[PDB]
Design a protein around this ligand. Structure first.
Ligand SMILES: Nc1ncnc2c1ncn2[C@@H]1O[C@H](COP(=O)(O)OP(=O)(O)O)[C@@H](O)[C@H]1O
Ligand SMILES: N[C@@H](CSC(c1ccccc1)(c1ccccc1)c1ccccc1)C(=O)O
Ligand SMILES: [Mg+2]
Length: 333
């Protein structure tokens, strides 16, 4: 199966409006096209146009991303496949907005209902909605690690010091897999446990940002949720499934400070060019993503872009990068 690639353009922000920014991006959700105006003052007609698996314009809301992209992927996780979604694009374009989301200010909504909530919390909410006493015995475990300068931090660890480091090893049980030694995996017994877990993770990240330069823009964030499902149907026979979903928020594409982003590009180039050796081992991120990139996990990429003329070169870089990645084949479960 080819990696599926979608584009999400964010709306203008107040500073862009204040600077009287013009748009250089047109999205056509129906034709699944994004068309970028490239000639500035000089050449009013030149464009580059790309077709993707889906295209989300500035008016797309969090709930539309969920319904279109995540729901189908989560149903596949529930069938016991492994899936990955990662966000790629320049700092400021909405990777974290998309993957995690934000809380609406002054208290207006519950987390399960917040319209600014992104992929991670909606996914956790749906896992419990879908599975709960609906016949299956099931458990859910989460982990959240971040890669910065090729060091690995555990945002969910009971340790009060976020700087305490994890270590990665090959997994002798699983050919393309790693063991993250020290990684706290929290059993989430029900939906009413979700928020406090995410909240404490976010507070550890805020600390991390005070400790390390340009932390949030240089970091890669790797949230994983594993679902163990058990069934005893018609004979009394017992049929076990395990689904895993990785939700990944990459370093800003404008970027050992950068080894993982660099190596991901070299890995994607190797896969599309079909070159014989693919350098997964040369970074922490690509070791973590090995199975998602030419392996047995179903992968989707959300490429995030700004609409503003100012960001022309990086917007074009992001679209070219993401477009070629459609050519990568995985073979799920
Ligand atoms: N689709 C969107 N709709 C509304 N605001 C958005 C959207 N995407 C991003 N933003 C806003 O733009 C700013 C940067 O988003 P952020 O998620 O921090 O980007 P990144 O993680 O790619 O650096 C934030 O203020 C965020 O609320
Ligand atoms: N993106 C925000 C956190 S948004 C987030 C969240 C979502 C996924 C993982 C961790 C936190 C949140 C913010 C603040 C307190 C708790 C949780 C969130 C936003 C909306 C609904 C549910 C969770 C940040 O970088 O701090
Ligand atoms: Mg971010």
């Amino acid at each position: 199966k080819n990696i599926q690639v979608v584009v999400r353009c964010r709306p203008f922000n107040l500073a862009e409006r204040k600077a009287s920014a013009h748009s250089i991006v047109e999205c056509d959700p129906v034709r699944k096209e994004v068309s970028v105006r490239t000639g500035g003052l000089a050449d009013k007609s030149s464009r580059k146009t790309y077709t993707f698996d889906m295209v989300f314009g500035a008016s797309t809301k969090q709930i539309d991303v969920y319904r279109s992209v995540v729901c189908p992927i989560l149903d596949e996780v529930i069938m016991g496949y492994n899936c990955t979604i990662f966000a790629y694009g320049q700092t400021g374009t909405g990777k974290t907005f998309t993957m995690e989301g934000e809380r609406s200010p002054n208290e207006e909504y519950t987390w399960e209902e917040d319209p600014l909530a992104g992929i991670i919390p909606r996914t956790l909410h749906q896992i419990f909605e879908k599975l709960t006493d609906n016949g299956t015995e099931f458990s859910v475990k989460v982990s959240l690690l971040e890669i910065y300068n090729e060091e690995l931090f555990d945002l969910l660890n009971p340790s009060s010091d976020v700087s305490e480091r994890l270590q990665m090893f090959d997994d002798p049980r699983n050919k393309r897999g790693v063991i993250i030694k020290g990684l706290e995996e929290i059993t989430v017994h029900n939906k009413d446990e979700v928020y406090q877990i995410l909240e404490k993770g976010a507070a550890k990240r805020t600390t991390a940002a005070t400790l390390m330069n340009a932390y949030s823009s240089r970091s890669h964030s790797v949230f994983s949720v594993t679902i163990h499902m058990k069934e005893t149907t018609i004979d009394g026979e017992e049929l076990v499934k395990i689904g895993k979903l990785n939700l990944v928020d990459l370093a800003g594409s404008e970027n050992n400070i950068n080894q993982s982003l660099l190596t991901l590009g070299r890995v994607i180039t190797a896969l599309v060019e079909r070159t014989p050796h693919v350098p997964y081992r040369e970074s922490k991120l690509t070791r973590i993503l090995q199975d998602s990139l030419g392996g047995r996990t179903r992968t989707s990429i959300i490429a995030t872009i700004s609409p503003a003329s100012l960001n022309l070169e990086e917007t074009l870089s992001t679209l070219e990068y993401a477009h070629r990645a459609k050519n990568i084949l995985n073979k799920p479960e």
